[PDB]
Design a protein around this ligand. Structure first.
Ligand SMILES: *[C@@H]1O[C@H](CO)[C@@H](O)[C@H](O)[C@H]1NC(C)=O
Lengths: 167, 488, 112, 79, 136, 292
């Protein structure tokens, strides 16, 4: 839980780079496993078919990358399709589908949390530089000057003068 | 018949990519489109977002004075480029929109970049204009690609498109220079501590109404800022609550200080004639000659543009007088046609468009010259008025009999003499421009008609002494009426 | 002004709601009236009807702070009725009536 | 009247004395409207510059008197 | 000479303030504050902006390889059956809305097309997530 | 109180006094005099536009080719136009003189029989101020501005009718431009009369301040209140300056708007004329005269 919340508080460029790299790594990771399924059944030599394939038009590693980029972001081109006679491909497709719909969702949640947190802008209070001691109402009293910067109002503001001393 | 980017001539054979992708004809035009459309779709959301502590500070980034005139001449040549493109495509069989649609998008790119600058200059935020910076380099890069592609074919100065491209690269280059200028000026994106600047005193002051001297160049030119004031006064009357303290420089105290500086300079220069008429003249000159010459130069430019008006309508009526009025596609390079100046200037459509743009510039610059002259006159008054006021405080009331008569004289003086001097200062730009204007006018009549217009211009100039004679007569009549009405 | 040798343009003095418990916290779902009891230690001790005109410099602010049960957002209602609005020697009409089904309160009777 | 009559009389003489004196140059709508438009704009500077010079002489006279006024006897300051 | 508005909208002419710069984070917050018509207008424009911008680069990258010319069986197109700018626009909007058409798909032998494809999905998800958060 | 005064001021501001000025001119000039004046102005502009059209039609025939014969009608029309200007100019001067002489006689005969209580109740200073200065303006400024306004207004409407003649579709563009220029004129006039009154009411204290100091040189210098008077002089001049500065700036804006509109007319006239002439075989003289 702690290591997950750490990335939530990162700045805009860091989260953009992390999110972009995570999607690219996920896309690249599926390209490797999809290429493995090709290496098993669909060889580089086409052989004029002679064997029922399960991933059509997958002639090279780049084709597997195109299959991965189409299936994980739910585009679904038709030039390359998944077929039967490959139970591991069906299993990896279900695994790829569920992680996909979750990885964007958890990244989408970070944007929701980010836009809520980034709207704080709390360092908008104006004060003085020193302390003033003078007379008020006839008696010597301590005093200070406060101010606000935000266009809105500081609603239900409470003020405490906490004197710290070594006694 | 399709409607693609480049024409379908030879079954779209021009769409080939061999013999060099960049060397292709249709390709280089598309490359210019890319940076323009990039700016469009990167600025629209930011602009719609923006559409107290910021509305009261009309700040400006340095170089904006040059940027405004730079984009103005840029949009001028861009609409000219659209006119040049359509002229070349009319003679061709296919539509060939590739000659005026890229430049058509470039014009929309120029206008949106200017309003983005104004929308982002209302507040001190120089970090948002990096999109403009990354746009200008890409525009400059693709502009140079077109220039080098034309040089590799050696079209030359015959086709006006080559000259337009050769100047657009310099125009884009000047934009890059004035853009990187603000880097060294501010250091907002490539350094630690940005050298931020504060708004002027007049802009920061709570009560200020005449903010024209410190406003964007578009408003400074066409008085667009007055729209607000011109509307509010329709409901409520005008009092000393809307109007407020004049700007720091426009106030009479600073004008008085400048006048004393000029007097001290004139005294140290030639103290042989102290407080002489020529001494005051030279002091006023060296004090206000900067803006005085500025107004004169604007009026000279306005007069030159005003002459182009009739010089432009000459072509339109001449083109109609031409019997055949056929097109001139003879000149061509690499298959595609290219217009020439000797026929581009004669085409009726572009000539009317160019006249409209030239007349717009004219009718604008004329107003600037008059406004500067009027602005100098009021400032000169506020300075001259207090100069006499200081003299009144320092004068000696000797010769009471001679001093009594002068009391009425000095009151009448500050009333009519100061007012009459301002009229001279108001009309001084007109006095400076009238000789060269009339000289250019009579010369143009000769080249237009011949010896006939020479005699005509003489008859027109013959009315000048008649006006002078009746003016003396009217002055004599006015004196007699005033003398009689005084006793009446 | 102050007896020390200076003046404050917007010096603020606070008078409580004069609640039965003396706390600035009231519970309301049907319109009710709130009265602040001026005393010796109150700015209204020297309040005269002559100062009740419109051209006086004395603004009474009543800031209403309350959180909604729906979304937990805090609401800041501001009021600045000056002495021009209040009139001397007046009182509110009975705002609430009695009915068999439910208690009723006339909202238009506020201005009466 | 002279202000209103100067341009009409000028343009009439030009079109008349063109053909009747030297018809070697045939008239044309191109040159005709060019000359007409040039007269329509240039009519105003001529009748305006007459007022400009009348203003300059009066301004020069008045400013000369102002210099004489400044050179008058002023009250001597302290020491 | 009032201090607090009687209606409630207490306005104060805060002047004599130092030059306060505005970053891009405040701009994002102001986008959230836009009302329903303003948000819908800028949302539709931004999506059309993204769609046409990606359409332009796809049309550019199609004309770059030579797919705009009539392929005589040999020249493998970076995008199949792309004929005109309208066809390129349809392909671009399909990628950025996860629709998927199949007929005018994208194939190998064009790494630049692959790079444009992957970047659109990344940027498309980012703007989609931003749009969801804004309206939410 | 204040709201009623502002409402009354706004109502008085919008009141251009059209009927009042019209009735004054009609009663002063005369039924026969005013008829001659308006006829002379109308006839002068009619022959003006007629000679312009004749020039277009005559030069067109010369380019397509009785040239010497046609030139005589031009000279005849030129003399008629010159004579019309002399008649119109003389009529305007005579009408103003007759109006002034009748207005003064009526005012003099009316004030000479004023009731004795009116003299004590009304300030004689304001009566003389409203009598002497006002009639001098009516005598010396009313005829000149009226003749210029009549010449300008008639010239403008005649020019617009020429644009409609050379371009029938120009009315589709005239309607959106006529309303915007009327709107600008409205918002200008309501704001310019007040600014003229304010400029006069602020420049008068300047002369008063100069008069006050030059009288009391000795007492002012004895008081040693010079520093305050220097600030006072600057303050009065500053109010005067900004008046004279707002005025011209507002005036410039009106002119700028007018000229921009005028340029738009040029475009909207010439452009269509091109596509009209090349298609409908319109003579070059018509488009040339319209553009001029
Ligand atoms: C292009 O068209 C011209 C004109 O018909 C022809 O002469 C030329 O051979 C064509 N070129 C090609 C490559 O088709």
């Amino acid at each position: 839980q702690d290591v997950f919340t750490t990335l939530v508080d990162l700045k805009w460029p860091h989260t953009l780079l992390i999110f972009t790299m995570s999607f690219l790594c996920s896309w690249l990771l599926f390209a490797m496993v999809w290429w493995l399924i090709a290496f098993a059944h669909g060889d580089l030599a086409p052989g004029e078919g002679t064997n029922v394939p399960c991933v059509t038009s997958i002639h090279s590693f780049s084709s597997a990358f195109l299959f991965s980029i189409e299936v994980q972001v739910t585009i679904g081109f038709g030039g390359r399709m998944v077929t039967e006679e490959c139970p591991l491909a069906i299993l990896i497709l279900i695994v790829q589908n569920i992680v996909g719909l979750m990885i964007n969702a958890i990244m989408l949640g970070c944007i929701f949390m980010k836009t809520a947190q980034a709207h704080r802008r709390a360092e908008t209070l104006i004060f003085s530089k020193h302390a003033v001691i003078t007379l008020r109402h006839g008696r010597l009293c301590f005093m200070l000057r406060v101010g606000d910067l935000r266009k809105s109002m500081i609603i239900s503001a409470t003020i405490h003068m906490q004197v710290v001393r070594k006694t | 018949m399709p409607l693609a980017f480049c024409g379908t001539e030879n079954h779209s054979a021009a769409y080939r990519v061999d013999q060099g992708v960049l060397n292709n004809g249709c390709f280089v035009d598309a490359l210019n489109v890319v940076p323009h459309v990039f700016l469009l779709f990167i600025t629209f959301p930011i602009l719609f977002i923006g559409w107290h502590i910021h509305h009261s500070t009309w700040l400006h980034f340095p170089g904006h004075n040059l940027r405004w005139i730079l984009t103005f001449i840029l949009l001028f040549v861009l609409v000219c480029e659209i006119a040049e493109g359509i002229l070349s495509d009319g003679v061709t069989e296919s539509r060939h929109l590739h000659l005026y649609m890229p430049a058509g998008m470039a014009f929309m790119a120029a206008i949106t970049s200017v309003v983005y600058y104004h929308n982002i200059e209302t507040s001190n935020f120089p970090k948002l204009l990096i999109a403009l910076l990354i746009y200008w380099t890409l525009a400059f890069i693709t502009k140079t690609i077109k220039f080098v592609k034309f040089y590799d074919h050696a079209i030359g100065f015959s086709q006006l498109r080559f000259c337009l491209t050769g100047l657009l690269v310099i125009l884009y280059g000047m934009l890059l220079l004035v853009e990187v200028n603000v880097i060294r000026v501010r250091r907002y994106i490539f350094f630690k501590t940005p050298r931020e600047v504060k708004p002027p005193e007049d802009l920061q002051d709570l009560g200020v109404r005449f903010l024209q001297p410190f406003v964007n160049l578009l408003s400074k030119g066409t008085y667009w800022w007055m729209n607000a004031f011109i509307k509010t006064a329709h409901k409520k009357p005008i009092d000393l609550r809307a109007i407020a303290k004049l700007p720091i420089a426009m106030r009479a105290l600073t004008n008085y200080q400048r006048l004393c500086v000029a007097f001290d300079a004139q005294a140290r220069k030639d103290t042989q004639s102290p407080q002489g008429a020529r001494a005051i003249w030279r002091a006023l000159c060296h004090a206000f000659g900067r803006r005085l010459i500025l107004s004169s130069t604007f009026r000279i430019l306005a007069d030159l543009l005003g002459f182009a008006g009739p010089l432009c309508i000459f072509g339109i009526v001449d083109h109609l007088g031409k019997e055949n009025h056929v097109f001139q596609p003879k000149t061509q390079f690499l298959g595609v046609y290219f217009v020439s100046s000797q026929e581009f200037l004669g085409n009726a459509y572009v000539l009317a468009v160019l006249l409209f743009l030239a007349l717009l510039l004219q009718r604008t610059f004329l107003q600037a010259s008059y406004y500067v002259a009027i602005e100098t006159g009021i400032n000169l008054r506020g300075a001259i008025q207090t100069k006499i006021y200081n003299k009144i405080m320092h004068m000696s009331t000797s010769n009471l009999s001679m001093g009594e008569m002068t009391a009425g004289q000095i009151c009448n003086l500050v009333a009519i003499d100061t007012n009459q001097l301002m009229w001279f200062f108001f009309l001084c730009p007109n006095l400076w421009t009238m000789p060269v204007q009339i000289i250019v006018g009579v010369i143009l009549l000769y080249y237009i008609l011949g010896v006939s217009a020479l005699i005509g211009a003489a008859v027109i100039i013959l009315l000048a002494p008649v006006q002078y004679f009746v003016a003396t007569k009217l002055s004599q009549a006015q004196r007699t009426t005033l003398e009689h009405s005084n006793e009446r | 002004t102050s007896p020390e040798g200076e003046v404050v343009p917007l010096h603020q003095v606070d008078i409580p709601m004069e609640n039965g418990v003396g706390g600035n916290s009231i519970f309301l779902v049907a319109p009710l009236i709130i009265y602040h009891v001026i005393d010796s230690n109150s700015p209204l001790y020297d309040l005269a009807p002559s100062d009740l005109h419109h051209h006086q410099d004395l603004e009474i602010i009543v800031i209403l702070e309350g959180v909604v049960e729906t979304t937990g957002i805090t609401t800041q209602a501001r009021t600045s009725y000056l002495a021009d609005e209040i009139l001397w020697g007046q009182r509110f009409v009975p705002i609430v009536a009695e009915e068999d089904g439910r208690y009723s309160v006339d909202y238009s009777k506020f201005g009466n | 009247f002279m202000n209103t009559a100067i341009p009409i009389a000028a343009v009439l003489i030009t079109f008349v004395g063109h053909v009747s004196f030297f018809k070697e140059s045939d008239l044309s709508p191109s040159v005709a409207f060019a000359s007409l438009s040039l007269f329509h704009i240039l009519v105003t500077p001529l009748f305006l510059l007459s007022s400009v010079v009348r203003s300059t002489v009066k301004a020069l006279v008045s400013v000369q008197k102002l210099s004489e006024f400044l050179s008058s006897a002023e009250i001597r300051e302290e020491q | 000479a009032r201090f607090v508005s009687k209606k409630g909208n207490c306005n104060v002419a805060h002047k004599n303030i130092r030059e306060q710069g505005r970053f891009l984070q405040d701009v994002f917050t102001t986008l959230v504050d836009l009302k329903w018509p303003h948000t819908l207008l800028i949302f539709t424009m931004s999506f059309l902006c993204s769609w046409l911008l990606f359409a332009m680069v796809w049309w550019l990258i199609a004309f770059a390889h030579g797919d705009l010319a009539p392929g005589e069986g040999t020249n493998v197109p970076c995008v199949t059956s792309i004929h005109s700018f309208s066809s390129a626009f349809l392909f671009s909007i399909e990628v950025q809305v996860t629709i998927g058409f199949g007929g005018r798909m994208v194939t190998e032998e064009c790494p630049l097309a692959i790079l444009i494809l992957i970047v659109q999905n990344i940027v498309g998800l980012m703007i989609n997530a931003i749009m969801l958060g804004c309206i939410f | 109180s204040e709201e009623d005064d502002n409402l009354s001021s706004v109502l008085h501001q919008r009141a251009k006094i059209p009927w009042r000025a019209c009735t004054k001119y009609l009663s002063s000039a005369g039924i026969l005099l005013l008829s001659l004046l308006v006829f002379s102005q109308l006839l002068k502009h009619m022959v003006l536009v007629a000679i312009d059209y004749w020039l277009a039609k005559w030069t067109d025939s010369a380019l397509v080719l009785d040239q010497s014969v046609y030139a005589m009608v031009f000279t005849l029309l030129c003399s008629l136009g010159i004579v019309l200007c002399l008649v119109t100019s003389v009529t305007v001067e005579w009408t103003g003189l007759k109006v002034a002489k009748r207005l003064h006689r009526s005012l003099l005969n009316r004030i000479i029989l004023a009731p004795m209580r009116f003299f004590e109740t009304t300030p004689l200073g304001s009566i003389l101020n409203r009598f002497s200065s006002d009639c001098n303006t009516i005598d010396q400024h009313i005829p000149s501005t009226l003749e210029c306004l009549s010449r300008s207004t008639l010239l403008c409407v005649s020019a617009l009718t020429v644009i409609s003649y050379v371009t029938p579709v120009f009315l589709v563009a005239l309607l959106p431009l006529a309303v915007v220029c009327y709107f600008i004129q409205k918002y200008f006039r309501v704001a310019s009369r007040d600014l003229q009154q304010l400029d006069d009411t602020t420049q008068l204290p300047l002369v008063s301040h100069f008069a006050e100091t030059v009288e009391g040189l000795t007492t002012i210098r004895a008081f040693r209140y010079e520093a305050r008077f220097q600030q006072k002089l600057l303050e009065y001049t500053d109010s005067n300056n900004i008046a004279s500065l707002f005025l011209t700036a507002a005036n410039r804006w009106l002119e700028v708007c007018m000229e921009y509109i005028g340029a738009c007319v040029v475009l909207i006239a010439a452009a269509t004329s091109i596509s009209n002439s090349l298609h409908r075989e319109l003579s070059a003289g018509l488009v040339g005269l319209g553009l001029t």
